[PDB]
Curated annotation (Swiss-Prot), chain A:
Cellular-component GO terms for this entry: fungal-type vacuole membrane; Golgi membrane; proton-transporting V-type ATPase complex; vacuolar proton-transporting V-type ATPase complex; vacuolar proton-transporting V-type ATPase, V1 domain
GO terms of biological process kind: endosomal lumen acidification; Golgi lumen acidification; proton transmembrane transport; vacuolar acidification
Additional notes on this entry: Present with 22500 molecules/cell in log phase SD medium.
This protein's encoding gene: VMA13
Primary location class: membrane
Role description: Subunit of the V1 complex of vacuolar(H+)-ATPase (V-ATPase), a multisubunit enzyme composed of a peripheral complex (V1) that hydrolyzes ATP and a membrane integral complex (V0) that translocates protons. V-ATPase is responsible for acidifying and maintaining the pH of intracellular compartments. This subunit is essential for activity, but not assembly, of the enzyme complex. This subunit is also required for silencing the ATPase activity of V-ATPase when V1 is detached from V0.
Any one Pfam family match given in the protein's UniProt record, by short name: V-ATPase_H_C
Cleavable signal peptide: none
Protein name per UniProt: V-type proton ATPase subunit H
From Swiss-Prot, chain B:
UniProt name for this protein: V-type proton ATPase subunit G
Family assignment from sequence similarity: Belongs to the V-ATPase G subunit family.
Disulfide topology: none
Primary role: Subunit of the V1 complex of vacuolar(H+)-ATPase (V-ATPase), a multisubunit enzyme composed of a peripheral complex (V1) that hydrolyzes ATP and a membrane integral complex (V0) that translocates protons. V-ATPase is responsible for acidifying and maintaining the pH of intracellular compartments.
Subunit structure, interactors included: V-ATPase is a heteromultimeric enzyme composed of a peripheral catalytic V1 complex (components A to H) attached to an integral membrane V0 proton pore complex (components: a, c, c', c'', d, e, f and VOA1).
Subcellular locations according to the entry: Vacuole membrane
Residues of the full protein shown: 2 to 57 of 114
Residues annotated with N-acetylserine modification: S1
UniProtKB/Swiss-Prot annotation, chain C:
Subunit structure, interactors included: Homodimer. V-ATPase is a heteromultimeric enzyme composed of a peripheral catalytic V1 complex (components A to H) attached to an integral membrane V0 proton pore complex (components: a, c, c', c'', d, e, f and VOA1). Interacts with VMA5; the interaction is direct. Interacts with VMA10; the interaction is direct. Interacts with RAV1 and RAV2 components of the RAVE complex, which are essential for the stability and assembly of V-ATPase.
Region (Interaction with VMA10): 12-31
Record region (Interaction with VMA5): 1-13
The organism's taxonomic lineage, starting at the top: Eukaryota, Fungi, Dikarya, Ascomycota, Saccharomycotina
Residue runs in coiled coils: 8-38
Record's miscellaneous remark: Present with 16134 molecules/cell in log phase SD medium.
Protein name: V-type proton ATPase subunit E
Gene label: VMA4
Function: Subunit of the V1 complex of vacuolar(H+)-ATPase (V-ATPase), a multisubunit enzyme composed of a peripheral complex (V1) that hydrolyzes ATP and a membrane integral complex (V0) that translocates protons. V-ATPase is responsible for acidifying and maintaining the pH of intracellular compartments.
Family designation: Belongs to the V-ATPase E subunit family.
Places the protein is found: Vacuole membrane
Annotated source species: Saccharomyces cerevisiae (strain ATCC 204508 / S288c)
UniProtKB/Swiss-Prot annotation, chain D:
Parent-protein start and end of this portion: 14 to 77 of 840
Protein name (Swiss-Prot/TrEMBL): V-type proton ATPase subunit a, vacuolar isoform
Function: Subunit of the V0 complex of vacuolar(H+)-ATPase (V-ATPase), a multisubunit enzyme composed of a peripheral complex (V1) that hydrolyzes ATP and a membrane integral complex (V0) that translocates protons. V-ATPase is responsible for acidifying and maintaining the pH of intracellular compartments. Is present only in vacuolar V-ATPase complexes; enzymes containing this subunit have a 4-fold higher ratio of proton transport to ATP hydrolysis than complexes containing the Golgi/endosomal isoform and undergo reversible dissociation of V1 and V0 in response to glucose depletion.
Organism classification: Eukaryota, Fungi, Dikarya, Ascomycota, Saccharomycotina
Species this chain originates from: Saccharomyces cerevisiae (strain ATCC 204508 / S288c)
Subunit-level organization: V-ATPase is a heteromultimeric enzyme composed of a peripheral catalytic V1 complex (components A to H) attached to an integral membrane V0 proton pore complex (components: a, c, c', c'', d, e, f and VOA1).
Family as reported in the entry's similarity comment: Belongs to the V-ATPase 116 kDa subunit family.
Subcellular location(s) per record: Vacuole membrane
Gene behind this protein: VPH1
Misc remark: Present with 55714 molecules/cell in log phase SD medium.
PTM characteristics: Glycosylated.
Length: 461, 56, 52, 64
């Protein structure tokens, strides 16, 4: 069989094997002074001789015996390593793999030896248990849920300042996630691993690719770390509920994906960032209209996507994801009624620019509709711009957002209809605009100058 | 190894495409599997309904 | 330069090209696990509504 | 370790190599444009050139 083929040729895993193999622990002596019996030591020795050359899983049972009975981390790491070496190779230790797999008992026994002494120990064991679970002849959710709840495996995972630790841990979790059933239990323990997964990704964005560090750059080690994190994510997000839940909790961290796509050339990192967003924007996902607004507006998703479309990546699939995501965000905002959007923002008092909220057409259609008591709705808007400046001052975060928007809306309407000029004068908005030129911030004086020039043009040609 | 290796890198580009294409075709098989095992789940749900009909 | 230096450069490169395709290949069939549940679930549901 | 890709016609390959050596070039391996996916001709790269021309138009515009 040769079980799982990952974590055999993997570099961080090889670094961990050197430490274990460097050290030589004599079983014969331990066994003689008692910590184990002669039969367990004879088997362990014979086991080294099979791996290096020539032709058992019959050997499996005394090694399981040794692991449990001894408490000594050095012998147990050497026994566990040898077991790992066989499990993955299909040149050495095909028979070994079968022996676990037939009888679930030696797996539960192998799970025992997990959560013991040194951090290397917990990795090796975790690697062997994870290899049998993903073979489709056995599965147990309880093992995976249980291993998740624990302190020691999550502590190792949390550290990212040792490449080796993180690399193995994210991979164990993720490999298991491929199989649909785990996705549900893995998500329960999310809140522990998930900020850390986000931290590796952010960490990559900030450190320039123009250099080379050996920790995570454009070299093979870094490329895998980013990939693994994103892959673990993508997998959970495939379920329709989970994806809605992901956006609402992790929002800040989530927006950072757009950034990854931009700095990398790596088709592994980028495809997955765009894809994870595409899944959450999907029709299938509950409250997709909300998530789409949030992404486009805050995260600048639409502008970022449009720029991407010109500079596509060689692989086709990457192109498909760029095109499909681009369509939902854009379609969604414009296809809602113009009158609805305008009334909804003014009433709640929360205003922000949006794709059809800045279009000339939006206003053109909506002017007539306003009239009910001489453009009563427009008049309420001028009243809102007036109110904000006087009450609660100006250059407070909230109140400043509204002013620029309110001023954009009033230019378009005024430039469109000459009758609007009376409305500014009656309400007293015309004076408020003159003050706004003087009121700080570039976007504010910019909008005020546009607001003034539209008014002037109809008074005096 | 200059004029052996270039031929080797040339071969890797064709093999690279091929791994990807074989996974893109595996995907396509998965789609048929979905339509096949679903065609089977409906007529096993028919007899589920026929079972509690002959009981009533 | 030398035959050793180009050889080294050779093992790293064909490794990256090949590994990258294998990792992409995984991503395609990770996505095939999602589409398998999704089409199967749609198709079954449409008919089971009619069966009910 | 910054990726360099360099091209010329073959004949002056030897005299090109040389001038490069003395400036600091290591791990010189001749390839073809085919070998990396990225140095193949795509519609994608022609659009970048069109955008680069837009930059050039906006720079004149501003200098004026």
């Amino acid at each position: 069989m040769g079980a799982t083929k990952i974590l055999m040729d993997s570099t961080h895993f090889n670094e961990i094997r050197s430490i274990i193999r460097s050290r030589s622990v004599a079983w014969d002596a331990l066994a003689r002074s008692e910590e184990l019996s002669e039969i367990d030591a004879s088997t362990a020795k014979a086991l080294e001789s099979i791996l290096v050359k020539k032709n058992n899983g019959k050997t499996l049972i005394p090694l399981i015996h040794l692991l449990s009975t001894s408490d000594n981390e050095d012998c147990k790491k050497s026994v566990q390593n040898l077991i790992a070496e066989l499990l993955s190779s299909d040149k050495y230790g095909d028979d070994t793999v079968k022996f676990f797999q037939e009888d679930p008992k030696q797996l539960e026994q192998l799970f025992d030896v997990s959560l013991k002494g040194d951090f290397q120990t917990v990795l090796i064991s975790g690697f062997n248990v994870v290899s049998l679970l993903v073979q489709n002849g056995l599965h147990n959710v309880k093992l995976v849920e249980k291993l998740l709840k624990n302190n020691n495996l999550i502590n190792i995972l949390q550290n990212i300042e040792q490449m080796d630790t993180c690399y193995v841990c994210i991979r164990l979790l993720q490999e298991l996630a491929v199989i649909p059933e785990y996705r549900d239990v893995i998500w329960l323990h999310e809140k522990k691993f998930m900020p850390t997964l986000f931290k590796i990704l952010q960490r990559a964005t900030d450190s320039q690719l123009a250099t080379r560090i050996v920790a995570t750059n454009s070299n093979h080690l870094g490329i895998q770390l980013q990939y693994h994190s994103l892959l673990l994510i993508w997998l959970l997000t495939f379920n329709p509920v989970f994806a809605n839940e992901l956006v609402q909790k992790y929002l800040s961290d989530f927006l950072d994906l757009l950034k990854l796509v931009k700095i990398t050339i790596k088709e592994k990192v980028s495809r997955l960032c765009i894809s994870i967003i595409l899944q959450c924007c999907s029709t299938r996902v509950k409250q997709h209209k909300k998530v789409i607004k949030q992404l486009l507006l805050l995260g600048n998703a639409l502008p970022t996507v449009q720029s991407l479309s010109e500079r596509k990546y060689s692989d086709e699939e990457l192109r498909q994801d760029i095109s499909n995501l681009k369509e939902i965000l854009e379609n969604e905002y414009q296809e809602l009624t113009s009158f609805d959007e305008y009334v909804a923002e003014l009433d709640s008092k929360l205003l922000c620019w949006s794709p059809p909220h800045v279009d000339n057409g939006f206003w053109s259609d909506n002017i007539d509709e306003f009239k009910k008591d001489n453009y009563k709705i427009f008049r309420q808007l001028i009243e809102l711009l007036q109110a904000k400046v006087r009450n609660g001052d100006v250059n407070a975060k909230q109140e400043k957002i509204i002013i620029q928007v309110a001023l954009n809306d009033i230019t378009h309407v005024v430039e469109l209809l000459p009758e609007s000029i009376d409305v500014l004068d009656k309400t007293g908005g015309k004076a408020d605009i003159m003050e706004l030129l003087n009121h700080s911030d570039s976007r504010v004086k910019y909008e005020a100058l546009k607001a003034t020039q539209a008014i002037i043009g109809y008074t005096f040609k | 190894s200059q004029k052996n290796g270039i031929a080797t890198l040339l071969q890797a580009e064709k093999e690279a495409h091929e791994i990807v294409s074989k996974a893109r075709k595996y995907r396509q098989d998965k789609l048929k599997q979905a339509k096949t095992d679903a065609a089977k789940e409906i007529d096993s749900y028919k007899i589920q309904k026929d079972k509690e009909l002959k009981e009533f | 330069l030398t035959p050793n230096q180009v050889n080294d450069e050779l093992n790293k490169m064909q490794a990256f090209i090949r590994k990258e395709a294998e990792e992409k290949a995984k991503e395609i069939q990770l996505k095939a696990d999602q589409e398998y549940e999704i089409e199967k679930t749609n198709i079954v549901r449409n008919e089971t509504n009619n069966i009910d | 370790m910054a990726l360099v890709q360099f091209y010329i016609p073959q004949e002056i390959s030897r005299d090109s190599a040389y001038t490069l050596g003395q400036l600091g070039l290591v791990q010189f391996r001749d390839l073809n444009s085919k070998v990396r996916a990225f140095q193949r001709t795509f519609v994608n790269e022609i659009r970048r050139l069109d955008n680069v021309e837009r930059q050039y138009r906006y720079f004149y515009s501003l200098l004026k």
